[PDB]
Amino acid sequence: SEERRYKRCGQDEERVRRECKERGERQNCQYQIRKEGNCYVCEIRC
Numbered sequence: 001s002e003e004r005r006y007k008r009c010g011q012d013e014e015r016v017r018r019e020c021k022e023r024g025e026r027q028n029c030q031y032q033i034r035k036e037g038n039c040y041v042c043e044i045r046c
Contacts, residue, residue: 002046009039016040 006023008016017033020042024031029046 006042
């Protein structure tokens with residue numbers, strides 16, 4: 001029911017992916033990397 005998206009235009013893909021995984025795993029919430037334009041987006045589903 002709840003979806004969080006963190007758009008990270010000030011970061012490269014490698015960092016976004018790394019920190020999205022960290023963020024999901026730390027919280028036991030599901031994580032996925034999306035794109036908006038050329039910016040990578042961390043999506044968290046708890």
